[PDB]
């Protein structure tokens, strides 16, 4: 019981971070 939309955004945001770094 997490939020699919928020989680996918969370993951999307984390991938940008990893890619920038």
């Amino acid at each position, epitope marked *: 019981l997490w939020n699919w939309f928020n989680i996918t955004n969370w993951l*999307w945001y984390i991938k940008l971070f990893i890619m920038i770094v």
Partner: antibody
Amino acid sequence: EVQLVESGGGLVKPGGSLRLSCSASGFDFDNAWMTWVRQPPGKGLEWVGRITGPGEGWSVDYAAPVEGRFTISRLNSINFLYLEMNNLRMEDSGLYFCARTGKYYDFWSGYPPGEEYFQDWGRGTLVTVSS
Amino acid sequence: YELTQETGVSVALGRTVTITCRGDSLRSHYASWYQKKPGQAPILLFYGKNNRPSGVPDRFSGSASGNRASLTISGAQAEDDAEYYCSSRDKSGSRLSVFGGGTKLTVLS
């Protein structure tokens, strides 16, 4: 052992309402996302709408042709999905399916909110909107 | 109408054929693919990057690049004659889903 059975199709006058029902068994329904899909005879499939799970707060989305006229709902103790259509049109005529809907997101290549897909289907129930 | 598919495609028995699905959202999102025969329920064939569900023969595989998703059938059988629908997001970031117009796959007789 997954069984999806839609019900409630019939002749309706083109200003009227109709409630459709989708019975579910053979999977964890309470947490499953469910989508409604329609097909006019001799024509394509059209996405109607989708109800999410707990943790999405059962948020519901609708294709633009049905916003405000159609309402998706559910009751989880008996595993029944529902579709209330009001102010029907001849465009709304078709074979309506309920589909068990998985969610997909590939961390590395994906983009929010990923995509949804229809893993199980019922045989549908026939809706004829003609005056 | 954001997903475009060939209206018809034919294939000789035993040969290989590929159907396309096309939209701007396909630059961001994968498509799922569905077989549909008259009087029968759609069958999920393939979805996301590499996912074939249990029960679907290996001759079916999807791919993607650019604004295109392709379902390829390798070793076409009589029973593959059907309509095929792609599905994805109508637009990038959308919570809605849309179907393509459908492709009539004819296994030539």
